[PDB]
Design a protein around this ligand. Structure first.
Ligand code: TOY
Ligand code: CL
Length: 298
């Protein structure tokens, strides 16, 4: 977990962009992978906090260059790039700022119905076009096969928790994985390009027009199940809930809604294990401790 000063930020940019004068700078945001700085109040510069987050950022830059004029909404436009080292695949990236605020569930629910419905329509169109992008050209590395992922997660959890769980608890963990892996519905899909972190904090909104004006944070994008981009919005607490996503599904012409509901339900059940595994890979020990404690009360 690297941190940066404004000076280190400026120096790093100046080396590669000497003719770009920096007038203003301040932290605009911070995620699990990068800190973001607002330079000149007209450009968002992401710096990785660790190597994994830099690989994320490298992925983001590379996907955005392939899809930059293929979508019905604005997306982050890469303007500045950093360099690789032995530690980071990309030392930083600078993007054009997209004005707007996140379309939070609270904001969405306070909109006139007609504007809510237009938001579901515009999200559907964006997903339908995104999931229809021809991926024949793309890197095969981007393919995230869900059956391989779940099998690998089972092995990681065994590896992580072998000495933390009593034998009968570990058997029950093994049962859970074995059960998930015998259900074909989770692993039979037609892979396409997916945003893969398609949640409300990555949907920007223009409160003057009451319309969606951007989709951001493509660092998790990959070629996997397109249903991923609906289930990320179905959570009642931090996301839009079932009523609204069912509007999105209807505009998208989804043919198998009860499968999306089944995938959401399993994902919800899977969260304790995602916290254990993501906790360790992204070095968040509280995520890891909380999931481990959920499992001991399974
Ligand atoms: N905070 C508690 C919630 O955390 C997760 O969702 C949240 C995800 O954690 C958020 O995603 C973030 O965390 C995930 C890992 O969970 C990373 O893969 C992703 N790059 C990062 O942006 C995502 N963008 C929003 C979503 N509601 C759980 N899926 C649901 C849980 O209620
Ligand atoms: Cl319509």
């Amino acid at each position: 977990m690297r941190t940066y000063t404004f000076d280190q930020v400026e120096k790093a940019i100046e080396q590669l962009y000497p003719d770009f004068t920096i007038n203003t700078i301040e932290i605009s945001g911070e995620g699990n992978d990068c800190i973001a700085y607002e330079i000149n109040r007209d450009f968002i510069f992401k710096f990785p906090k660790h190597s994994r987050g830099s690989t994320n950022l490298f992925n983001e830059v590379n996907i955005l260059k392939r899809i930059h004029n293929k979508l019905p909404l604005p997306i982050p436009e890469v303007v500045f790039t950093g360099m690789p080292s032995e530690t980071y695949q990309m030392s930083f990236a600078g993007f054009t700022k997209i004005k707007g605020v996140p379309l939070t569930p609270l904001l969405l629910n306070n909109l006139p119905k007609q504007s809510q419905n237009q938001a579901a329509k515009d999200l559907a169109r964006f997903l339908s076009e995104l999931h229809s992008i021809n991926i024949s050209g793309f890197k095969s590395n981007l393919v995230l096969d869900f059956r391989e992922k779940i099998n690998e997660d089972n092995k990681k959890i065994k590896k992580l928790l072998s000495r933390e769980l009593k034998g009968p608890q570990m058997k029950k963990v093994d049962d859970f994985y074995r059960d998930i892996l015998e259900n074909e519905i989770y692993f039979k899909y037609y892979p396409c390009l997916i945003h893969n972190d398609f949640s409300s904090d990555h949907i920007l909104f223009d409160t003057e027009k009451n319309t969606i004006c951007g989709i951001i944070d493509f660092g998790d994008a990959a070629i996997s199940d397109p249903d991923n981009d609906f289930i990320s919005l179905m959570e009642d607490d931090e996301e839009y809930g079932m009523e609204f996503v069912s509007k999105i599904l209807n505009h998208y012409k989804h043919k198998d809604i009860p499968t999306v509901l089944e995938k959401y339900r399993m994902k919800e059940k899977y969260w304790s294990f995602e916290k254990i595994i993501y906790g360790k890979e992204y070095g968040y020990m509280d995520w890891y401790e909380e999931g481990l404690n959920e499992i001991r009360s399974a």
